[PDB]
C-alpha cells in the first residue's frame, strides 16, 4: 500500500540526533516525492522539508536549514530525517507526506501516521482567520483562507491545499486546486475560491467532517499553513 | 512553479530511464525467424534455444544476447507489418530438404522448395532488407541425403539436377538458392546444413552475426 | 451446380445497388461548393517537438483535454506527452515492441495498446500506488490489431488483421460483437462522434459501416484501388475521409451512401497513411509515406497547405478536439506538434 | 653547423 | 663546415610554401564545409587541424624568401609558431584516434563497443587537443624575436635557455626534439602500424571471399590501408628522421657534406609533410566514398 | 464442408445486399449541402481555418 | 589610456557577442542574412581591435608590418562600410515592406538577399582598396614608434597629395555616413508617412511584431548615430578647418577629441549583437 510508518522519535534532550525513518508499504517511493511536516501540540502544521524524486532537489524550512537534513534510501523505501541539533521549539508532530508531480497529480494526497517528538516544554501569508465554531449539521459551513500574492500563475492553476484532520488523527488531501477534489472524498467539499480569497464550502455537515482545517499554498517552496477550525458537532 | 519545477524533474527522469533503455536495445542483438513451411523450423528454432503473431524468443550464447522474432503464426498480410523489421541485423530462414516427392502434400501443383524460393527472393530483393543479411538453414540435410541416392534432385524442378549423389544435390540446391539474391553486393546468405548437431548451429549463427556487425563497422567507419 | 445462379442473384442485387447509386448520384460535392472558401495557405509552423521516443514511432492519439498526448513506438514506450509544456508524464514500459496502435480513453484514465501479439492492452494511468498497471489483456483476434479506438469508458471496439472489427469491454474482457464482414485485413478505425457508429478501413480498399452493437455492414463504401490504410470521420456529420496507398484522400457520405469526389495530385505517387479531419470538417490533414505531410480543402481538395518537413514517413496524425494543434507522429523518433 | 635548425621554417626543432 | 647558402632554394622553397598554402586551405576547406553543411568528429578535427596548421605559412613564406627579414609581426613569431606545431601534434594525433576508433569497431564487433563508447567523438577529440597544447606550449613561451644573428635583420629564433639550464641550451633543444619524435611520429605510427595490421589481417581472416566483389574488397581495403600506413610514413619519416641525423651532425661530426646535405634537404622535407598534411583530407577524410558522395 | 461454407457465403452476401439494398438514399446535392452548411456555420472558432488570437495559443 | 581601454572593452564585449549572433543566426534559417552580414562584419573588427590597441597605446605604434596593418585598415573600413550598407539594404526591404508588404517580396524576388549582401560586400571592399593600398609604415619625424599612416603623395603629387587627401576624406565621409544615413532617413520618413495614414496600428503594443522587427533597428541606427557621427562631424571638421579659416583653438580641439569620437565610433561594432538579442 502507501501506509507509512513513521519510525523514531522519543523523549530526546535538546541539542541530540534523532532518526525519524519512516517506512513505505511501496509506491514506487523513489518516484513520488517526501515531504517533512511538523506540529507542536498547542500549535498548527508547518512543513519541515522536501525531496524530489530520486534525490534530485532538497529543500528545508529556514528554521530548520542547518539543523535538520533528510535523505531517502529508494531500494528499501524509506526517508530519513536527521537532526543535527533539537531545541524547545522542536517539540512537534512529525506527519510525512506522499506528492507526485505532474498535469493529472493529486500531491499531498495520503500523510502518514507520524511521530512525536517530546523534546522539552516576505512569504505568503495563510491568514485562515476561522476557529472552532459550533455548527449542527446539513448547515453550509464555509471556511475561508486568504493570501498575499495571488496563488494564480501563468499556467492558469492557484496552488491551494485545503486539508481535514480530526483531533490526533493524520489529515487527507480535499482540494488540491481549489477546484479538484482528492479520492475518499464526497462531492459535497469544494474550495471555490477566487485568485486570492479561498472557501470550502460543506453542504452536508457530518461527524468526519467535524475536525479542523488546514489550507496551503505551493506557490513557494517554504510551505505556509493556517490556523486549525474544529467543526464540533454542536 | 514548484510543482512546474517538480513536473520537470520527473520529466528528465523519464528521459534518463528512456535513454538507458534504448541504450540497452541497441546491443541488443535481433535476428527474424522466416520459416517458409512448419516443418523443420520447430526444429531448428529448437537447436537455436538450446496465439500471438510475434514469439519472442530470447537467449545469450558467448556473451552475445540474440531476440529472435518468430512470425510463423501471424495469418495475414505480410507486407502490413514487414516495415517493422526494418532494423533487424539479421535474418533467420530455416527451408527442410526433405520436401520434394511431397510436393506441398495438399497443393500437388508447387514444391514446398518452389514456394521456399518465392518466399526467399521476396525477402531478398524486398525494399525494407536492402542490406540485411540472411541466415540461411537447411533443414532435414540428414533424410535428404538418406533418400537422395534412391531419388535424385531432378524431380523437383524437370532441369538437370546434377548427379544422384548428395554431394551434386546440396550443391545445386544452394546455388539455386543463392542465385535469387539480386543485391549480392551488398546482402550475402550463410548457407548451411542444419543438422542434429544443436550448438554448432548455434554458433554458426554466432559467426554469421560476427560477420554483419563487422561489415557494418566497416561502413560505419572511415572506409567503405 | 446452384452457386453460380446464387452468385447471378448477388450479381443483379448489386446492379439495382449501382442503379440506385447512379440515380441518387448527380452532382459532386465540388459541383456544389466549386469556388466556396477558397483556403489559400494556412501552412503552420513546428511549435512543439517531442523527442523521447528512439525508434520507429507507429501511433499517437490525443486526449479529450486536447492538451495531453499518448504515442508508441517501436521501443517499448508509450510516454504521455503534456505538449503545452513539452513535459513526460508517464512513460510505460510495453510488453510488445511491435505496437501500430494506441489510444486515449476520454475520461483520460486509460490507453490502450495493440500491436502485432494479436492483444489490446489496457492501462491504468491514474494509479492509488502511483505507477501505470495494466488493467486488461485483451485477446481474441487471430491476426494483428490495426487500431484500438476507446468507443467509451469501459466498452472498447477495435480493428485487428483478422478481417473482423472486434468489440471488446475492460469491465468483463469477453467479446461482445464479431462485426464480421470484411474480405481483407482491416487497418484502421474511426468512430461516430456520437459514437452509436464506426467505420473500418481494410486492406480490401472497402470502407464499410457498422453500428455500435449488434450490427452487420449497413452500408458498403467502394471506389478505392489499392487498400484502406488510414480512416477518420467528419466532426459532426454524415462524412468520412478515406485513405489509401493510391494517393486519394477520398471521403464518401452516409446519409446518401455516395462517392462525392478524390484527392487525388499528379505529383504525387506514394500513399496515405494517417488522416484526421479538422475541426467543422473544413480541411483534410493527410499524413503520406514521401516523409511529407499536407492538408486539402475538404470541399475543394486542392493544396490548402502543406505541412512537410519531417524526415521518415509520417506514420500517425491526429488532431486535437480544440482544434488548436495538429500533432504529426512520423517514423523519425520526434513528435512535431504542429499549430 | 652553428643554425640550430630554428630558422627557415616554422618548426623551432 | 656550413655552406648553408643553395641558391636555388631561395626562391623555390617558399614558391612551395605558396603552393602547400593554397591546396591545404581550400582541400581542408572543402571537407570542413560539407560537415557543417564517431569517426566523423575525428574527421572534422584532423581537417580544422590541418587547415589551422596551413594557414598561418606565408608569415614563414616571407621569412624564407626575404632572407631571414621577417617582418609579418613580432609576437606573430610565436603565434604561428604555436599553431603550426598544435597543429601538427592534433593532426597526428587525430589519425591515432581514428585509427584507433576504427581498429576498435573492426577488429571487436562488440568486444571493443564499450571502447569505443567510452573513446566517444568529441571526449577523445578533447583531450587529444588539451595534449597537442600542452606539448605545444613551450613553442610560445620560447618562440623569441629580432636579432637575425644577434644583429641585422630580425629573425623568429628560440632561447632554450630562458626556462631550461642557462649552460646548455643545446640540451633542452635536444630534448625537446627527442619528446617531439618520441611523442608525435614514434609511438603515434606505432598505434596505426598495430592496429592497421590488425585491421589488415581482420580482412584477411573475416573476408575471404572467392568471389568477384570478395577479391576487389581485399584489394580496396589492403590498398587503402597500406597506403595509409605507407603516406604517414613516407611524409613524417625524412622530416623527423633529418631532425635526428642533424642532432647527431651537432654530436657525431659527420663529414661536411652529409651536413650540407641535411641543410639543403631540411627545407623540402618539411614542404613534403606540409603538403602530405595539406593532402590528408582527400586521402583520409574525403576518401570515405558516402563523405565523399556527401561532398559532390 | 466447403459447399456448405459456400452455400453459408452465398446466403449472408444476399442478405447482406439486400439489406443494402433496403437503405434509403438521400440526395447528394442535399448531403453536400449539410456538409457546407456545417462548415460556415463552425468555421469561425476554427484556429487551422482563421489564425485565433496569437496571445491565447498555449503553443 | 582610456582610448586603448576603450578598443580593447569593446574586443572582449563584441567578440562574445557577435560569434554567439552570428553562429545563432546561421542556425536559424532577406532580413536573417542582413543581421547575420552586419554580425560577420563585426567579427573582422575584434581579430583586429587588439592590434589596433597596441597601435595607439604608446604613441600609434604598430610594429607587425606593412602588410598586417594594411589588411586591418581594410577591415576596420570594410566593416563599418557593409555595416552602413547592409542597414540601407534591409532598411530597403524593411520600408517598402511597410507601405506595400506585397511590393516587399518583388524587391527580394529582383534582389535576393543573399546576392544583396554579396554585391553589398564587393562594393565596400572596392571603395576601401584606397585605405588599404595607401597605409604603409615607417618612422615618422624618425619616431621610434612604426605607424602606417595615411600616404597620399604615393598615388598623386606632393602639392596635389592635399588636395587628394580632402577629397578622400570627405568622400569617404560622403559614402559612408551622409548618403546611406540619408536614404535610410527617407525610408523612415516614409515609415512615418504610412504609420501617420495607419493610426490604427501607431501603437507600439498593437503592432509588436512589425514595430520590434523596426524598434530593433530604430535602437540599431540611434546607436550606429550616436557613436560615427561625432568620428565623421570631427573628420570633416578637421579638413572644414583646413581650408576654410576656423580659429586654431577650435582645430585643436578635434586634435584632442578624435581619438575620443573613433574609439566610440568603433562602440557600435559591440553593440549591435547586444541590440539584436
Same mark, same amino acid.
Given at each position: ?234 | ?37 512448419? =516443418? ?35 495469418? =495475414? ?85 546434377? =548427379? ?61 | ?339 | ?13 | ?296 | ?59
Amino acid at each position: 500500500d502507501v501506509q507509512l510508518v513513521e519510525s523514531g522519535g522519543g523523549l530526546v534532550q535538546p541539542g541530540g540526533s534523532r532518526k525519524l525513518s519512516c517506512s513505505a508499504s511501496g509506491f514506487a517511493f523513489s518516484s513520488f516525492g517526501m515531504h517533512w511536516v511538523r506540529q507542536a501540540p498547542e500549535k498548527g502544521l508547518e512543513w519541515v522539508a522536501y525531496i524530489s524524486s530520486g534525490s534530485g532537489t532538497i529543500y528545508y524550512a529556514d528554521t530548520v536549514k542547518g539543523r535538520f537534513t533528510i535523505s531517502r534510501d529508494d531500494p528499501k523505501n524509506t526517508l530519513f530525517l536527521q537532526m543535527t541539533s533539537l531545541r524547545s521549539e522542536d517539540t512537534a508532530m512529525y506527519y510525512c507526506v506522499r506528492s507526485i508531480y505532474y498535469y493529472g497529480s493529486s500531491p499531498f494526497d495520503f500523510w502518514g501516521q507520524g511521530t512525536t517528538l517530546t523534546v522539552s516544554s516576505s512569504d505568503i501569508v495563510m491568514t485562515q482567520a476561522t476557529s472552532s465554531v459550533p455548527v449542527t449539521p446539513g448547515e453550509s459551513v464555509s471556511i475561508s483562507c486568504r493570501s498575499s500574492k495571488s496563488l494564480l500563475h501563468s499556467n492558469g492553476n492557484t496552488y491551494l491545499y485545503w486539508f481535514l484532520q480530526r483531533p490526533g488523527q493524520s489529515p487527507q488531501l480535499l482540494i488540491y486546486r481549489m477546484s479538484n477534489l482528492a479520492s475518499g472524498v464526497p462531492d459535497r467539499f469544494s474550495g471555490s475560491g477566487s485568485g486570492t480569497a479561498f472557501t470550502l464550502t460543506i453542504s452536508r455537515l457530518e461527524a468526519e467532517d467535524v475536525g479542523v482545517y488546514y489550507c496551503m499554498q505551493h506557490l513557494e517552496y517554504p510551505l505556509t499553513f493556517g490556523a486549525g477550525t474544529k467543526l464540533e458537532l454542536k | 512553479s514548484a510543482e512546474d519545477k517538480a513536473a520537470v524533474e520527473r520529466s528528465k527522469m523519464i528521459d534518463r530511464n528512456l535513454r538507458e533503455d534504448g541504450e540497452k536495445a541497441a546491443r541488443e542483438v535481433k535476428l527474424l525467424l522466416l520459416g517458409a513451411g512448419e =516443418s523443420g523450423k520447430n526444429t531448428i528454432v529448437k537447436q537455436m534455444k538450446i496465439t500471438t503473431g510475434i514469439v519472442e524468443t530470447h537467449f545469450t550464447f558467448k556473451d552475445l544476447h540474440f531476440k529472435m522474432f518468430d512470425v510463423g503464426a501471424q495469418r =495475414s498480410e505480410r507486407k502490413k507489418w514487414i516495415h517493422c523489421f526494418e532494423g533487424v541485423t539479421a535474418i533467420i530462414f530455416c527451408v527442410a530438404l526433405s520436401d520434394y516427392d511431397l510436393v506441398l502434400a495438399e497443393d500437388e501443383e508447387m514444391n514446398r522448395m518452389h514456394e521456399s524460393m518465392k518466399l526467399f527472393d521476396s525477402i531478398c530483393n524486398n525494399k525494407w532488407f536492402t542490406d540485411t543479411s540472411i541466415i540461411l538453414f537447411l533443414n532435414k540435410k540428414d533424410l535428404f541425403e538418406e533418400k537422395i541416392k534412391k531419388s535424385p534432385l531432378t524431380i523437383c524442378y524437370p532441369e538437370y539436377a546434377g =548427379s544422384n549423389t548428395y554431394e551434386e544435390a546440396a550443391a545445386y540446391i544452394q546455388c539455386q538458392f543463392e542465385d535469387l539474391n539480386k543485391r549480392k553486393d551488398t546482402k550475402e546468405i550463410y548457407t548451411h546444413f542444419t543438422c542434429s548437431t544443436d550448438t554448432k548451429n548455434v554458433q554458426f549463427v554466432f559467426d554469421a552475426v560476427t560477420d554483419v556487425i563487422i561489415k557494418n563497422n566497416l561502413k560505419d567507419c572511415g572506409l567503405f | 451446380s446452384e452457386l453460380d445462379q446464387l452468385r447471378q442473384e448477388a450479381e443483379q442485387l448489386k446492379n439495382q445497388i449501382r442503379d440506385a447509386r447512379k440515380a441518387c448520384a448527380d452532382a459532386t460535392l465540388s459541383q456544389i461548393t466549386n469556388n466556396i472558401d477558397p483556403v489559400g495557405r494556412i501552412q503552420m509552423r513546428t511549435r512543439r517537438t517531442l523527442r523521447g521516443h528512439l525508434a520507429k514511432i507507429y501511433a499517437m492519439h490525443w486526449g479529450t483535454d486536447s492538451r495531453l498526448l499518448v504515442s508508441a513506438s517501436q521501443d517499448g514506450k508509450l510516454i504521455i506527452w503534456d505538449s503545452y509544456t513539452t513535459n513526460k508524464v508517464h512513460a510505460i514500459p510495453l510488453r510488445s515492441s511491435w505496437v501500430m496502435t494506441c489510444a486515449y480513453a476520454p475520461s483520460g484514465n486509460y490507453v490502450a495498446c495493440g500491436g502485432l501479439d494479436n492483444i489490446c492492452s489496457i492501462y491504468n494511468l491514474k494509479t492509488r500506488e502511483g505507477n501505470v498497471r495494466v488493467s486488461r489483456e485483451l485477446a481474441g483476434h487471430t491476426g494483428y490489431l490495426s487500431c484500438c479506438r476507446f468507443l467509451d469508458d469501459n466498452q472498447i471496439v477495435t480493428s485487428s488483421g483478422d478481417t473482423t472489427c472486434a468489440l471488446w469491454d475492460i469491465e468483463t474482457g469477453q467479446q461482445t460483437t464479431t462485426f464480421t464482414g470484411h474480405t481483407g485485413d482491416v487497418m484502421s478505425l474511426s468512430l461516430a462522434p456520437d459514437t452509436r457508429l464506426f467505420v473500418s478501413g481494410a486492406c480490401d480498399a472497402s470502407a464499410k459501416l457498422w453500428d455500435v452493437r449488434e450490427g452487420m455492414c449497413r452500408q458498403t463504401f467502394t471506389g478505392h484501388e489499392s487498400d484502406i490504410n488510414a480512416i477518420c470521420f467528419f466532426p459532426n456529420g454524415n462524412a468520412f475521409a478515406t485513405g489509401s496507398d493510391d494517393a486519394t484522400c477520398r471521403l464518401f457520405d452516409l446519409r446518401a451512401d455516395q462517392e462525392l469526389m478524390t484527392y487525388s495530385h499528379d505529383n504525387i505517387i506514394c500513399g496515405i497513411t494517417s488522416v484526421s479531419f479538422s475541426k467543422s470538417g473544413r480541411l483534410l490533414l493527410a499524413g503520406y509515406d514521401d516523409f511529407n505531410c499536407n492538408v486539402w480543402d475538404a470541399l475543394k481538395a486542392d493544396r490548402a497547405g502543406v505541412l512537410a518537413g519531417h524526415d521518415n514517413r509520417v506514420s500517425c496524425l491526429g488532431v486535437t478536439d480544440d482544434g488548436m494543434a495538429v500533432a504529426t507522429g512520423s517514423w523519425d523518433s520526434f513528435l512535431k506538434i504542429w499549430n | 653547423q652553428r643554425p640550430r635548425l630554428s630558422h627557415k621554417g616554422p618548426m623551432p626543432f | 663546415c656550413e655552406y648553408t647558402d643553395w641558391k636555388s632554394s631561395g626562391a623555390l622553397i617558399p614558391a612551395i610554401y605558396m603552393l602547400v598554402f593554397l591546396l591545404g586551405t581550400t582541400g581542408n576547406g572543402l571537407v570542413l564545409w560539407t560537415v557543417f553543411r564517431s569517426a566523423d568528429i575525428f574527421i572534422a578535427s584532423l581537417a580544422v587541424a590541418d587547415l589551422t596548421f596551413v594557414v598561418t605559412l606565408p608569415l614563414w613564406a616571407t621569412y624564407t624568401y626575404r632572407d631571414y627579414d621577417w617582418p609579418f609581426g613580432t609576437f606573430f613569431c610565436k603565434l604561428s609558431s604555436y599553431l603550426i606545431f598544435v597543429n601538427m601534434y592534433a593532426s597526428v594525433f587525430c589519425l591515432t584516434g581514428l585509427s584507433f576508433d576504427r581498429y576498435l569497431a573492426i577488429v571487436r564487433p562488440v568486444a571493443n563497443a564499450r571502447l569505443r563508447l567510452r573513446v566517444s567523438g568529441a571526449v577523445a577529440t578533447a583531450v587529444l587537443w588539451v595534449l597537442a597544447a600542452l606539448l605545444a606550449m613551450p613553442v610560445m613561451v620560447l618562440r623569441t624575436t629580432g636579432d637575425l644573428e644577434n644583429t641585422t635583420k630580425v629573425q623568429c629564433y628560440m632561447d632554450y635557455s630562458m626556462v631550461a639550464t642557462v649552460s646548455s641550451e643545446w640540451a633542452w633543444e635536444v630534448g625537446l626534439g627527442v619528446s617531439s619524435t618520441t611523442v608525435g611520429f614514434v609511438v603515434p605510427f606505432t598505434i596505426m602500424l598495430t592496429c592497421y595490421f590488425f585491421i589488415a589481417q581482420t580482412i584477411a581472416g573475416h573476408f575471404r571471399k572467392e568471389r568477384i566483389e570478395g577479391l576487389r574488397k581485399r584489394r580496396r581495403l589492403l590498398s587503402i590501408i597500406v597506403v595509409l600506413v605507407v603516406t604517414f610514413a613516407l611524409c613524417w619519416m625524412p622530416y623527423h628522421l633529418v631532425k635526428t641525423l642533424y642532432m647527431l651532425g651537432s654530436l657525431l661530426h659527420w663529414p661536411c657534406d652529409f651536413d650540407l646535405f641535411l641543410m639543403n634537404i631540411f627545407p623540402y622535407c618539411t614542404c613534403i609533410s606540409y603538403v602530405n598534411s595539406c593532402l590528408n583530407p582527400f586521402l583520409y577524410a574525403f576518401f570515405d566514398p558516402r563523405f565523399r558522395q556527401a561532398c559532390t | 464442408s466447403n459447399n456448405t461454407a459456400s452455400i453459408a457465403q452465398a446466403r449472408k452476401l444476399v442478405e447482406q445486399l439486400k439489406m443494402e439494398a433496403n437503405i434509403d438514399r438521400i440526395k447528394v446535392s442535399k448531403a453536400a449541402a449539410d456538409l457546407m452548411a456545417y462548415c460556415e456555420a463552425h468555421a469561425k472558432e476554427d484556429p487551422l481555418l482563421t489564425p485565433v488570437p496569437a496571445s491565447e495559443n498555449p503553443f
